[PDB]
C-alpha cells in the first residue's frame, strides 16, 4: 500500500543514485510547503496514517533485498523487512508506536527492538562513531547483506547497528542534504569508500538546529548563529538562510509560516 522506491548497488552509477535520491525526495514531500526556498517535510501532527511512510526496497550484488520503512516526517529509517521478518526501532511514544503497526502487516515474524535508532544508540551498539564507519556503494552492499541475515542469526547486533548507520546516511541524510547526496555521488563516481568527514557529521548533527533557525528566522536572519564545520574540521558560523539553500534539501517541520 505505501509507495515503494527501488535501488540496487548492483551496477550502481551516479545516474541511478541521483534518480534514487530525487525519487525519495519526491515521495517525502509534495513540495507544497517551502520556506526561504527550502522544502519542509509534512507535519507529524494530524498527518493521516496513509501518508505517513514510504518504503525503500534495497537490492545488492548478491540479489538479496531488504525494504526500509521511512517516516515522511523526518525522512528516517524506522525499521525494515527482510523476507518473512520485520524489525522496528523502539518508538519514543504511543503515537509512533501506533503508527508503525501499519507497516509490514503481512510479514509473519514481527519484532520491535528494545532500543531506539538515534545515532547515539546506533554508534554505541556498533562500537563505532560515524567518523569511523565507511560509506559508499561497497559499505551499502555489505549492510544490505547484514540486514538480510539478522533474522537467522547470521548477523550480530553491532554489525546490524553499523549497517543501519550506513543505510541511514546514504539514504536519509542524502535526501535531507544536497551536500551529503553530493558526498555519496562522489564516492560512487570514483568507486571509493570512506568515512564521512567533519562537514558531513556536523551537518547531520545540525539538521534540527538548521530547520529551527530557518523556520523561526526573522525574514531569513537567524536569531543566533549556527556553527558548522569545513571538510578540514575548522569551524565557521552561518547567520542566515541564504548560504544554506544549496546545502539543505529538506527540513523537519517546526512551525507554521505566515501567508
Amino acid at each position, epitope marked *: 500500500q505505501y509507495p515503494i522506491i527501488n535501488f540496487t548497488t548492483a551496477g550502481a552509477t551516479v545516474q541511478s543514485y541521483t534518480n534514487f535520491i530525487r525519487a525519495v525526495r519526491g515521495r517525502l514531500t509534495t513540495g507544497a510547503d517551502v520556506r526561504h526556498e527550502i522544502p519542509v517535510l509534512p507535519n507529524r501532527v494530524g498527518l493521516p496514517i496513509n501518508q505517513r511512510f514510504i518504503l525503500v526496497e534495497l537490492s545488492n550484488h548478491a540479489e538479496l533485498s531488504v525494504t526500509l520503512a521511512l517516516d515522511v516526517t*523526518n525522512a*528516517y529509517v524506522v525499521g525494515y523487512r527482510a523476507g518473512n521478518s520485520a524489525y522496528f526501532f523502539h518508538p519514543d511514544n504511543q503515537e509512533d508506536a501506533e503508527a508503525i503497526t501499519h507497516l509490514f502487516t503481512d510479514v509473519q515474524n514481527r519484532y520491535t527492538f528494545a532500543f531506539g535508532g*538515534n545515532y547515539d544508540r546506533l554508534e554505541q551498539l556498533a562500537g563505532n562513531l560515524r567518523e569511523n564507519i565507511e560509506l559508499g556503494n561497497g559499505p551499502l552492499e555489505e549492510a544490505i547483506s547484514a540486514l538480510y541475515y539478522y533474522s537467522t542469526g547470521g548477523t550480530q547486533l553491532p554489525t546490524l547497528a553499523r549497517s543501519f548507520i550506513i543505510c541511514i546516511q546514504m539514504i536519509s541524510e542524502a535526501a535531507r542534504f544536497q551536500y551529503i547526496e553530493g558526498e555519496m555521488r562522489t564516492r560512487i563516481r570514483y568507486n571509493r569508500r570512506s568515512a564521512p568527514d567533519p562537514s558531513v557529521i556536523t551537518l547531520e548533527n545540525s*539538521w534540527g538546529r538548521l530547520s529551527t533557525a530557518i523556520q523561526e528566522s526573522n525574514q531569513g536572519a537567524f536569531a543566533s*548563529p549556527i556553527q558548522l564545520q569545513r571538510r578540514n574540521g575548522s569551524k565557521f558560523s552561518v*547567520y542566515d538562510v541564504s548560504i544554506l539553500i544549496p546545502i539543505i534539501a529538506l527540513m523537519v517541520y517546526r512551525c507554521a509560516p505566515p501567508p
Partner: nanobody
Amino acid sequence: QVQLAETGGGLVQPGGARTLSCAASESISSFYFMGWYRQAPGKPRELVAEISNYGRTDYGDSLKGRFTISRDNAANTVNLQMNNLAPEDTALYYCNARKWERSVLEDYWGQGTQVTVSS
C-alpha cells in the same frame, strides 16, 4: 521537556574566577552533547565549550586554557570553570543540552547566568 538550571554567576574583579554549574532534569548521559554558550554585549550568542558523551571537548577560539568544561556524573551536572577573568568575559552564560529525539538532535537551554567582570 528537559529543564536546565544554572548557578554560579556574579560580579568579579579582573583576574577573578567563576564556577558555573548546570543541573539537568534528567541524567546528563541522556545527552549527546552538553555545552556552555555566552552572549556578550552587542554580540550574538556564541559557543564557549561543548563536551560529548564520550569526553570529546571543543572550545570557542582562545578559551582553551582559560575555561574548562567538565561533567560530574554523580552530581549530574556540567560545569564551567572560568579562570583569570577580564571585562571581555562579561556576558550572559547559557547551559545547553542536546538530545537525540526522533532522529533529530534537539537543543535545550537554561535561562542563563550573568557573569560581570568589573575593575
